[PDB]
């Protein structure tokens, strides 16, 4: 499923970041970085879900997880 993050998608993210030229080894590196980030946030979000005795991860669970990792997100109920 990590391959679903295609080279064109990674290129678009780099373009928004102001990147003009990209090495061929960046795509695999980016996939690894994104996986680590997602794992960290999802782990905490699921912890909140289990504490609420819920079977559904809510947007609030994600917002709380981001907040505690110092990546506060505005627009999803906090």
């Amino acid at each position: 499923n990590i391959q679903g993050i295609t080279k064109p998608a990674i290129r678009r993210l780099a373009r928004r970041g102001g990147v003009k030229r990209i090495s061929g080894l960046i795509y695999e590196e980016t996939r690894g970085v994104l996986k680590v980030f997602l794992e960290n946030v999802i782990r905490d979000a699921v912890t909140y879900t289990e504490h609420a005795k819920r079977k559904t991860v809510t947007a609030m669970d994600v917002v709380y997880a981001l907040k505690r990792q110092g990546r506060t997100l505005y627009g999803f109920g906090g």
Binding site: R16, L66, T72
Partner: protein, 98 residues
């Protein structure tokens, strides 16, 4: 009945802010002036962002503020950018910078 907001000349709710302080596990007691002061500060900050966001909307020939306009207002102001440094505005995008 005269609302504490109208007594303080504010649009923000002093009574609600007081309840949120009392039930937010911040202290045992809350002074009468604390909610008034907090409500005024929240109102001032909202006015500042909204004024700057409305200007950005007018510059984009728009009559409604969208997340993009809020992001433009916050990132183009050194002080607002510092206050909201670790904050992500959903659908806000980035500043054009090459």
């Amino acid at each position: 009945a005269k609302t504490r907001s109208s007594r303080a000349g504010l649009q923000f709710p002093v009574g609600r802010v007081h309840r949120l302080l009392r039930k937010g596990n911040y202290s045992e007691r809350v002074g009468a002036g604390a909610p008034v002061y907090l409500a005024a500060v929240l109102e001032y900050l909202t006015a500042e962002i909204l004024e700057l966001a409305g200007n950005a909307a007018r510059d984009n020939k728009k009559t409604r503020i969208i997340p993009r306009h809020l992001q433009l207002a916050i990132r183009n102001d050194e002080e607002l950018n510092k206050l909201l440094g670790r904050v992500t505005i959903a659908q806000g995008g980035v500043l054009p910078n090459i």
